[PDB]
Design a protein around this ligand. Structure first.
Ligand SMILES: CCCCCCCCCCCCCCCC(=O)O
Ligand SMILES: CCCCCCCCCCCCCCCC(=O)O
Ligand SMILES: [Fe+3]
Ligand SMILES: [Fe+3]
Ligand SMILES: [Mn+2]
Ligand SMILES: [Mn+2]
Ligand SMILES: [Mn+3]
Ligand SMILES: [Mn+3]
Lengths: 283, 283
């Protein structure tokens, strides 16, 4: 270290990421350990085997995603720390702790309903793996040796704009469209509501990061759009795979009179993807 | 990634670091933004210039240390993440967020009392710089390329056993011995109480980390002792420098009838150092 900002000066109290950090502390008190999952255990046990499975693809996607994101944010925190972006780092401590609670929430649900011993990796197809097993850690880990604006934009695009701003947001919507209607899994849905609220700050950090780089040179806008489009095939290829699992196993939909509109879910994904694009201004 | 623990299985709910993570969430709700510093501003302004300075060396040491530690824990989190130690990572998200709040607390105090514009690096002598500007980032950053048991023990020794378990603990004691007696700076002392409570978990993570490595091969015990002793000269060399500043500027002690026992503070430092050693068992 050559010096310390809070010895030479203070935190930059007006910095957007300090304000986001402050909001994260105010809004981040929830604890997955307090969620009552006992009704969820009864719901899951009440289900037939073919209804039991209906929910597992989505939980498998979230549980791996939360865990990937918990591990893979560390290089972003490092890169920004090394750039002396102290307020970003303070905020990223809330981001990382949020994702830890997200991992915890889904794992507590799996334990409570009796599937913790079940290996849910069978529900990760090639497109999911390309995003979460490969493209996400590649883009983040790159920041250890290459913290160029190109690398940081690509990292924020994959992590915050695609994984969180497209897939996670759409998954929260899907959970609600399906189980909130069914009256099922109230503990899980309480957790989803807290995850979704945290996610708002995570996406805003991505937007801030990408926009501040675009702000220095509008040609980075083109890079942002390009990286969004490179991942789209895998995003929809996973969505299509989940859709086809749902269409092939309809008993939960039948039993609970959910006219599950998979083409409305698909449209919600397309819509999320397009509005994330629109939250980055070329100028 | 080759897979995900919370897809194949669950969190290891009995893991000591998951239990420490759970305690951190329960005990880590405090927010520096809620501390009332208005009485602290009046106290500081009431002081003469020569009393004003008396407190600044210690705040300078803490503010830089909190900031160093916030940046320099990231490689430990990374190394353990890459080892698949998921429960350690979950706990480290609380550790990192705690230190962010510590940075925030001291910087809020500096702002409130009117010294935020003052560059307090003048109170970092060569021994302080050797620990915080050099040895700490060197030991932590090494973990990016070398996560051997030797490297991890050395990192935990410098960070958790020396910086936190010797210097920080002794600084908390010193703040209380001096200002809690004077009736001064109630907001700062509220913050110190919260820092000290957080620190308990940070030191326990260090103990767990060092002991689990020693447990695999008792020869690492010798390394631990050696790394403790290598840093001791700098620890006491900074303590002696602070002591001599205090002896050379006594007006706060006089004004507030603090018979400040600098040789009792020195003994407290020696005692902390020796009991950290004793918390690691050769077997
Ligand atoms: C059937 C419609 C498809 C809806 C899309 C569902 C997407 C599943 C979500 C899995 C990825 C979750 C990523 C977590 C991100 C974070 O924790 O910030
Ligand atoms: C006059 C007696 C000397 C007492 C020793 C005072 C030591 C000052 C403390 C500065 C280091 C603080 C390190 C912070 C560690 C953490 O935040 O985990
Ligand atoms: Fe997120
Ligand atoms: Fe600490
Ligand atoms: Mn395909
Ligand atoms: Mn010396
Ligand atoms: Mn999440
Ligand atoms: Mn601290």
């Amino acid at each position: 270290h050559d010096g310390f900002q809070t010895v030479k000066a203070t935190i930059d109290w007006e910095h957007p990421m300090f304000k986001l950090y402050e909001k994260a502390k105010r809004n981040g008190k929830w604890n997955p350990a307090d969620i009552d999952f006992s009704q969820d255990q009864k719901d899951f046990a009440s289900l037939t085997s073919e209804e039991k499975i209906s929910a597992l693809p989505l939980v498998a996607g979230f549980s791996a995603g939360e865990e990937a994101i918990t591990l893979d944010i560390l290089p972003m925190a490092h890169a920004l720390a090394r750039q002396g972006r102290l307020e970003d780092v303070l905020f990223l401590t809330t981001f990382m702790h949020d994702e830890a609670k997200h991992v915890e929430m889904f794992s507590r649900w799996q334990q409570a309903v009796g599937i913790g011993q079940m290996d849910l990796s069978v529900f990760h197809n090639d497109h999911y793996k390309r995003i979460f097993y490969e493209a996400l850690p590649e883009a983040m880990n790159r920041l250890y040796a290459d913290d160029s604006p190109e690398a940081v934009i690509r990292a924020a695009t994959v992590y915050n704009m695609i994984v969180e701003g497209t897939l996670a947001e759409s998954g929260y919507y899907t959970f609600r469209q399906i189980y909130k209607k069914a009256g099922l899994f109230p503990g899980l849905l309480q957790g989803i509501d807290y995850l979704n609220m945290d996610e708002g700050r995570h996406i805003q950090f991505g937007i801030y990061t990408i926009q501040r780089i675009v702000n220095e040179d509008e040609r980075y806008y083109e890079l942002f759009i390009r990286y969004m489009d490179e991942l789209w095939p895998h995003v929809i290829g996973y969505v299509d795979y989940l859709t086809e699992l749902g269409k092939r196993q309809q008993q939960l939909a039948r039993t609970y009179a959910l006219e599950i509109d998979y083409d409305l879910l698909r449209h919600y994904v397309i819509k999320q993807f397009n509005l994330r694009k629109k939250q980055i201004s070329r100028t």
